[PDB]
Design a protein around this ligand. Sequence first.
Ligand SMILES: O[C@@H]1[C@@H](O)[C@H](O[C@@H]2CO[C@H](O)[C@H](O)[C@H]2O)OC[C@H]1O
Length: 324
Amino acid sequence: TIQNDIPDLYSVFKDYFPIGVAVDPSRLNDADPHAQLTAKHFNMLVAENAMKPESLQPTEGNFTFDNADKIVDYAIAHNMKMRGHTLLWHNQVPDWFFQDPSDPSKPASRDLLLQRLRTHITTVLDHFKTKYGSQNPIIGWDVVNEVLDDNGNLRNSKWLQIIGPDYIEKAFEYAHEADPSMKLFINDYNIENNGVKTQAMYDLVKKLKNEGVPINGIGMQMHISINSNIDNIKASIEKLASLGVEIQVTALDMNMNGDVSNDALLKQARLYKQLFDLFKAEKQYITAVVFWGVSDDVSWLSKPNAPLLFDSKLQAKPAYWAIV
Ligand SMILES: O[C@@H]1[C@@H](O)[C@H](O[C@@H]2CO[C@H](O)[C@H](O)[C@H]2O)OC[C@H]1O
């Protein structure tokens, strides 16, 4: 059962940015406490999995939007905005995209993969626009996800292998043409550490924007840990923000490295407070902060963990109180 009378989390940040959460379509019924926590605390929603490539086009031409639409319907019912995650990724993407259809032992050509990417992107954006029109809650999409490797080079996924480095620009071009009202984001992890990957993201977006690619923002996943350095996060936000693009914290959670002790929860509270003070200070750049999961019991991190503001019993943790 949830605490109904404590402050609605997002309301604390109404003069800063929307506070969202990634959800599962099976946790949206009125009588479900996870759904109750969702509607109470967040004014933005993201599909944890239902809008990924495999979730939307499992086999070629066979689009499965029911779960995604259920989440959209819920967002509309609760006056929430949404982020669309994600049009291209190297995980949770069906193998068929990359296969020659006449000979599945061989790879698709650059032209075929680009056409499939265009058809997927266009169908996905046209689906939400035609089904929901002006009520579509999605304000932007993670057009590409995790396209850098951890050394800052372009990740050598099948997209890069078959098409070449311009596949990124093409994804943005296709998305922009399908729905110019959508804000387009490039999303990634570890770019908050002010290391080689942060520099690589800055370099890549600088290059693509100067070439006219319609990139509107950079999504920083923010899968941080109990040991993360706030100074590095601040430096990363400043560097990326200098490009004149929006910054969104897209998948926030805190890896506790197996220590879920009460002492660790207090340390987590101090770190989350510093993190949100930083986000507030950077409100001129940050346009959304989204948690990757509603409560600890449904976090994607392996156990044991305690990554979020609500615990495995759906109760507000010390970090929640520290922030509000
Ligand atoms: O249910 C999990 C999802 O939570 C997970 O989502 C990933 C998390 O890492 C990044 O934020 C990425 O962009 C998200 O898509 O994906 C695996 C799935 O089993």
